[PDB]
Amino acid sequence: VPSWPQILGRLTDNRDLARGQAAWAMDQIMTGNARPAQIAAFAVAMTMKAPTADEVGELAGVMLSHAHPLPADTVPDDAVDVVGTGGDGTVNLSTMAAIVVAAAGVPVVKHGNRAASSLSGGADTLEALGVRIDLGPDLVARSLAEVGIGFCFAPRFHPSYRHAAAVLREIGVPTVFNLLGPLTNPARPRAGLIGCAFADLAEVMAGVFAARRSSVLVVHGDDGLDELTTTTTSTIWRVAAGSVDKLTFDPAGFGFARAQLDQLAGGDAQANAAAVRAVLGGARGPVRDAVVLNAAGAIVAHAGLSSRAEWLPAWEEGLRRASAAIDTGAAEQLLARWVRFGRQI
Amino acid sequence: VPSWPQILGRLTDNRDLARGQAAWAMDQIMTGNARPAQIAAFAVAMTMKAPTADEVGELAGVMLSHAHPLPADTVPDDAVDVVGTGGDGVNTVNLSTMAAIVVAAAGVPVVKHGNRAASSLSGGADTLEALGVRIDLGPDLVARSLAEVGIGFCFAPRFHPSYRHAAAVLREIGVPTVFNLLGPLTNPARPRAGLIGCAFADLAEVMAGVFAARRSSVLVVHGDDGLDELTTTTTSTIWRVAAGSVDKLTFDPAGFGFARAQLDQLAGGDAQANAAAVRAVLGGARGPVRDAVVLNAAGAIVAHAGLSSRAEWLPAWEEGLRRASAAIDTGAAEQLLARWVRFGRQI
Ligand SMILES: O=P(O)(O)OC[C@H]1O[C@H](OP(=O)(O)OP(=O)(O)O)[C@H](O)[C@@H]1O
Ligand SMILES: [Mg+2]
Ligand SMILES: [Mg+2]
Ligand SMILES: [Mg+2]
Ligand SMILES: [Mg+2]
């Protein structure tokens, strides 16, 4: 009933897939039953034909059903993710924002890869900071228990994605597959701060999150950043109670001086490492501001699990707690505790 | 300057390529420097972004410039081709191939380009091969076939060996792309006229565009029933290409007295079955198959007339129908096929 020619032909006719087809196509790829030419066609055609939440949801689902889980009852019910799609065109604001959030006591489980794969970045910079990025399910859990944060290395948790990843490296261009990182976190946290460079596709990511009933803020800086920016306003899709809701967000309302795009910027892994140490050590400046802002974001999303949570006080509490996790040195200390953890195994 | 991410990114942005990019891409493909994923992505991306005449011409041109030519001065200025894209999803009898033989028998030089089937049960080359005709001849001997029989057959895999890299890849995706247009645009003998079949109603105008740029006299045809031939079951759309301009027409056989046929009457089988249908028609069997053969054959004869400006549409069709029918009725077509087989076995 399903088949590659059927599905590819339907995509090249500019038609949404029937429900199930996207899933079948991803399952073919996962099971190794997909020629690298079919993977490539699907990936491009799914992109040029504007992909829908259901379709993206089916891809992420199938991927997740082949992924290694974390052991039962080790992921707190209120964990969050802090991550972006990448393809921005930075300093690793997410990485820092994630450390600050965990430091404030919100459990964080992150998903990522090394740069230029379809499943997000940040592992390089984490590796340059001394953190062990590729641990199995059991140790990611133990890290989340002992440290307050764990990192799920995509190759480790999605070994069947191998093929799709190789193919996508060669076409060397953004596709619908670049949305899968935030959506295929093996630990399935119910909250998060999710950045997206591709503005059209943010609302699609948001809808996938709505269907999971997650409490998530998908964020797009109106300067094109895959984070909440301080260059200008941002667009936020507030995902709550299964509903999506598009908003405009201006950090001026909380006293954030406008910064230039090129101050939140210019980062290879060894440099990004140094920016983290600078900033976690108290270096004031536009990078700190944007880390503080995005961390508050994740903490607001965490508050949104409560369902009695109000938007503006949630942001103040968020800004307050992230500021304090930095200024107390709890964040710097958490990073250190994270590195030590990785050495004591 | 140019790269796969540059070119693939532009296409995915739903943007027309810059001049030279399509050519660079096709040239990477032809020389073996393109990865399978790059090829598939390009072909699919180029299809979903409506491709332009310039783009398809650059693909076709790179291909031609890598193909094996026929020798100097062996192709008449007025040679015609009779060939389609294939991929109509109907396994009809081989209309183009039967048309080609009739046309050569009317005294119009035919240099046909061809291939085995990709989806149907028997392609032109398959059916020709089943008849005793040699499909695998090289350039020199294709030239000699044309001189001695009046017809030559250029087997695409033989003249376009560097297409091998794109062939396997495109087969694997199993869906038609812009690449499915190249066969009829890459006849290595570069004849200036033809009747060119297109299975895809939405890409047929682009093919006409490519032919218009070369200043060929060509009718690009699509049956409104989906045939990559002139049909007899209904009307056909014709992009007439002449003096560098394209001109869209609708064509109705009823006007030249043709009864409406049913698609299943034009249906065919494997290479042996399709070879028996050619023998039946060239033998004088009246009926719908013959009807469609005569019709297309006139079609090509009209494209041939169109090499000369001041040829008029109606009298050229009428003259075309007389000559196609006569070619069959006098035994001339049936004899040329025999001479053609004889020629193969005598080298
Ligand atoms: O496999 P398909 O996609 O169905 O295509 C069937 C055939 O039609 C095309 O050529 P040609 O113009 O010689 O067609 P003919 O069979 O009508 O002679 C193509 O080269 C195939 O041989
Ligand atoms: Mg990020
Ligand atoms: Mg970023
Ligand atoms: Mg044909
Ligand atoms: Mg046909």
Swiss-Prot record, chain A:
Q: Does the keyword Amino-acid biosynthesis apply?
A: yes
GO cellular-component term (any): cytosol
Residues annotated as binding anthranilate 2 are L168
What positions does the entry give for Mg(2+) 1 binding? S94, E227
Quote the SUPFAM superfamilies the UniProt record gives: Nucleoside phosphorylase/phosphoribosyltransferase catalytic domain, Nucleoside phosphorylase/phosphoribosyltransferase N-terminal domain
Q: Which domain of life is it from?
A: Bacteria
Question: Part of which pathway?
Answer: Amino-acid biosynthesis; L-tryptophan biosynthesis; L-tryptophan from chorismate: step 2/5
Q: Which cofactor does it need?
A: Mg(2+)
Co-factor note (free text): Binds 2 magnesium ions per monomer.
Q: Which InterPro entries match?
A: Anthranilate_Pribosyl_Tfrase (IPR005940), Glycosyl_Trfase_fam3 (IPR000312), Glycosyl_Trfase_fam3_N_dom (IPR017459), Glycosyl_Trfase_fam3_N_dom_sf (IPR036320), Nuc_phospho_transferase (IPR035902)
State the Gene Ontology BP annotations: L-tryptophan biosynthetic process
List the Gene Ontology MF annotations in alphabetical order.
anthranilate phosphoribosyltransferase activity; magnesium ion binding
Subunit notes for this chain? Homodimer.
Please give the family membership noted in the entry: Belongs to the anthranilate phosphoribosyltransferase family.
Name it. Answer: Anthranilate phosphoribosyltransferase
Whichever gene encodes this chain, its name is: trpD
